[PDB]
Point group: C3
């Protein structure tokens, strides 16, 4: 069967940069028959409300154990809401099932780290998609971190593409990878 | 269950600008377990056959009611072919089902307008993907309009990226969003 | 039902240019209810290990018969591993099925060839996504070739975007098209 893991809608400030909560992350991992679709969006708060062209690139890493459970140690972690989305409602069901492994990046296919770098428009409606208002966001798959069995990294890059200070309100971002076997 | 709503193959000139039919829009919304995939392509006609660096940006809005039924008042609307694609054939079934809501952009997740701006190659096979032969297409999700409960807007932008006149024959465009609950 | 055709993990050097194996191609075609997702990645070998700004553009074409069986005559072809992925493991099953047609690009929808040109990051983790380390990969759908019923072409373009020599280790690339009817 399919399975979706997600933050739920209306996330708290659940993305930490060096132990400070600064980004609201909506993250959805939907496993259909074989592939997992990552659907995500991010909103900066406080000192990340607006990002400058000189902003250092940074990763938001999700660490998962061998059962596909989110660990407490990443930048997006089990201290904030995360769990299964039941078909038919918008709840987060936090009690893990064996099925959660199906949302993880297949260890054999991604036995070394893989990546997808894509455009990440910022404040796109308000700036009417101006070319110099996009950065990049690179998904890194299974780059090692601590004792995590699986990792998903959202790495925001190339802020120097920006013509000036820009609201850190990302587009909806999509990535795809091969799901793990049960 | 999954459900697809689409224009069918070989659409008529069904994209209206200033109440004039000027673009042939192929649009498919496929809901699988949780996410909806937008798969779309566009061909300009008449004064929109060729676009150039002097072309002004424009939007094609689809308006849907609370049941996921396409309304008559958008730029792409219920006055042209639109409905469900049966698994196993290429017909368009016009009679609404409860299931059509499942193709809609989830109103909790998209409680304010969301966007994805992406490259939109033009005439890409013919021009062999020359870098200066792309524009952008931004999908806007749930921009408020009229009495619509849901909206999808295809906004064509950044014609100034083009090196010159180019056939408005878009790549196959893909976007993804979280589906509404039954 | 859904169905996935793929090369399996850790593919051999299975991309041929002038009858010489030069690229390792991971290719996955996953059909869900209606759409097919192409998930692919490439690693150059030998003379293709490093690519330069002056690299000759080239295509890797897959040719399929009317039943969705991969033919022997494309650049990626039936002389190497290819077949169905069972749900639950990473094997490659050679036994054809009626379902394999469902991975093919819908002949009526793509009676004229379609394309999607997208960014193709190279060596992206190592170069931390530097903008000048991307090329383009265009998927061409049903560009006619010989006696094939369906074709998928991966055309690698715009090497002249590169700032210098770069390891031909692509990002995970994703494309989407409407699947064929049984």
């Amino acid at each position: 069967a399919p399975i979706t893991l997600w933050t739920g809608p209306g996330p708290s400030i659940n993305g930490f940069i060096n132990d400070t909560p600064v980004i609201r992350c909506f993250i959805c991992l939907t496993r259909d028959s074989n592939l997992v679709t990552v659907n995500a969006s991010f909103v900066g708060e406080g000192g990340y409300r607006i990002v400058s062209p000189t902003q250092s690139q940074f990763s938001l890493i999700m660490e998962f154990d061998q059962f596909g459970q989110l660990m407490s140690t990443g930048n997006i972690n089990s201290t904030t809401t995360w769990g299964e989305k039941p078909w038919g409602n918008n709840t987060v069901q936090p009690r893990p099932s064996h099925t959660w492994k199906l949302c993880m990046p297949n260890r054999e296919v991604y036995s070394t780290p893989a990546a997808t770098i894509s455009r990440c428009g910022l404040d796109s409606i308000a700036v009417d998609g101006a070319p110099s208002r996009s950065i990049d966001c690179m998904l890194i798959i299974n780059k090692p971190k601590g004792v995590a069995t699986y990792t998903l990294t959202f790495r925001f890059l190339n802020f120097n593409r920006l013509s000036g200070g820009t609201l850190f309100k990302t587009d909806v971002l999509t990535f795809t990878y091969v799901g793990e076997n049960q």
